[PDB]
Ligand code: HEM
Ligand code: HEM
Ligand code: HEM
């Protein structure tokens with residue numbers, strides 16, 4: 249994938265003000281609530297019985313931070329997103345058996361969440377930059393199939 | 395992408411035996427018939443006014459056979475799809491702007507077209523060989539994004 | 541929607557199927573676990589080996605439910621409410637998985653009834669298969 | 682399908698948008714065209730440049746239609762079916778495209794009214810967006 253320079257800078261500046269824990273818990277809570285089947289992969293987490301249960305849950309919040317953090321690894325390495333996610337991909341495809349459509353789903357949610365914390369600051373060029381980033385991370389993870 | 399021997403054998407073998415022009419035409423017609431929005435891409439094929447008309451169009455069969463010929467290309471080169479379908483990649487993505495998800499649909503349909511023309515000889519083991527083939531192929535056309 | 545030609549095309553073929561019911565279900569299942577391995581993880585408890593007694597058993601039960609809603613092709617959603625709770629809420633099946641099963645069962649028909657499976661006929665079935673999925677995923681939308 | 686609790690959510694957030702239906706409409710469309718450039722291919726006759734006024738009044742139509750379905754949210758399909766013909770048949774629009782617009786509608790909702798796209802709202806909202814997508818893609822399935 250080829251990164252424009254205007255694009256590197258749009259992903260890079262936004263990134264630098266993201267509260268990873270705030271968006272993390274949120275991305276992930278919304279993934280569980282909005283696409284309820286993803287709940288299955290996360291059942292080790294305890295009570296996911298209602299929406300409130302879900303935004304109530306410590307692990308949901310805590311694992312949200314972990315995720316967003318892993319986005320950081322890509323933003324650190326836009327030219328090597330391929331190998332950043334290569335161990336994360338084994339786990340997601342092999343072990344946990346996640347359908348790659350779900351990464352698309354979390355990347356779309358991610359973007360709704362960044363919209364909502366950054367307002368007019370989450371510019372049309374800027375959203376196009378991010379949609380491509382999450383597109384990429386997702387294919388990065390999805391490598392381990394085809 | 396790693397091809398076991400059985401997978402190569404199973405693909406190569408069956409391939410041998412395919413009527414490129416009939417399945418090539420059948421595949422293509424099922425597409426336009428089953429997924430009618432696909433018709434928008436083929437209006438330089440004249441009359442697609444109905445299934446029977448789609449079914450008979452000399453240009454559709456004309457094309458049917460082009461497509462499936464190309465899968466053959468794939469078969470000849472399992473370890474090396476990614477490069478073989480670089481240019482067909484630009485065509486489909488930059489020129490025509492075809493959502494990738496319709497590659498999967500076609501693969502899917504190809505597969506029901508083999509099954510109908512092979513019956514019992516299309517064993518389960520065989521179908522998987524091929525699902526992977528068709529899938530590998532539609533990631534190689536959808537490279538030219540992410 | 542489901543066009544009365546659709547409702548027709550469908551019946552045509554469920555009646556070609558019919559008492560190959562149970563054989564066809566087993567087979568659709570088998571192709572689904574061998575072609576889409578991750579689908580076996582919903583079946584942790586079954587004997588998933590080719591031939592298996594339970595797979596047959598289960599297979600019949602799927603195709604049955606399928607033949608059942610072909611008998612109310614008019615109100616599928618209702619002929620089937622009972623199973624959404626199962627799939628959607630207890631089991632949490634990912635919708636993608638319904639297209640997988642859907643596809644293995646076209647393959648099955650195509651192997652056993654190629655003649656019967658004409659583009660148009662193939663279209664109607666698809667829409668069918670689609671509705672079913674939608675219903676079975678319904679406590680999701 | 683759309684439960685009672687969804688239909689409030691939807692109703693509620695629409696009450697809160699309403700005023701801005703033309704601005705949201707147009708930012709929705711602009712963002713779709715910068716983010717999903719293959720989508721322009723369908724508006725070959727538009728001034729697609731920022732600010733253009735065909736965008737402005739197209740995006741008025743878009744969300745007015747949606748606003749409309751919201752008041753007869755009980756029968757969306759009935760309400761919107763005038764737009765299928767055109768979208769499915771005439772324009773032959775790829776179903777992917779509806780998720781796309783739909784996603785950009787949610788982003789516009791989120792930049793202006795983030796406090797209201799609560800996650801429980803977001804979900805009612807996506808169900809509704811699918812329903813709409815489904816009716817305009819209709820006379821395929
Ligand atoms: C989309 C971008 C994603 C990224 C960047 C990502 C990243 C991560 C990271 C960094 C971990 C844990 C490493 C660890 O603590 O072992 C993790 C684990 C996990 N992920 Fe993801 N992941 C992504 C999407 C998903 C998706 C869709 C799912 C599935 C619905 C998912 C389900 C899980 C589960 C079930 C674990 C194990 C949780 C546990 O530790 O108990 N991940 N991921
Ligand atoms: C699925 C894997 C596919 C393969 C292997 C494939 C292959 C091909 C080939 C081999 C050609 C002719 C190359 C040339 O002569 O320059 C071609 C042209 C074309 N294909 Fe595809 N294609 C695929 C998917 C699709 C799909 C899904 C569509 C529609 C949704 C599509 C639409 C077209 C069109 C509209 C043309 C050229 C128009 C013309 O030149 O007359 N293709 N494709
Ligand atoms: C054509 C769509 C489907 C139909 C018509 C269908 C039909 C049924 C029926 C009738 C039963 C339960 C019989 C009973 O009450 O014991 C059932 C159960 C079950 N179904 Fe499905 N199903 C469909 C799709 C799927 C898919 C894709 C999966 C997952 C891969 C699935 C997974 C299951 C599971 C795991 C059970 C539990 C059965 C048991 O443990 O005994 N279903 N289905």
Ligand code: HEM
Nearest residue numbers: 720723724742743744746747764768772774778779782813
């Ligand atoms: C929720 C989704 C949508 C709604 C509610 C919607 C609404 C409308 C309405 C009300 C019109 C016509 C107003 C009139 O009759 O002049 C229209 C036309 C049109 N729509 Fe959609 N549309 C939707 C989705 C889409 C999508 C995703 C696309 C493209 C991807 C699209 C492309 C078009 C085009 C090209 C026209 C023709 C208008 C013209 O030529 O000026 N629509 N749509």
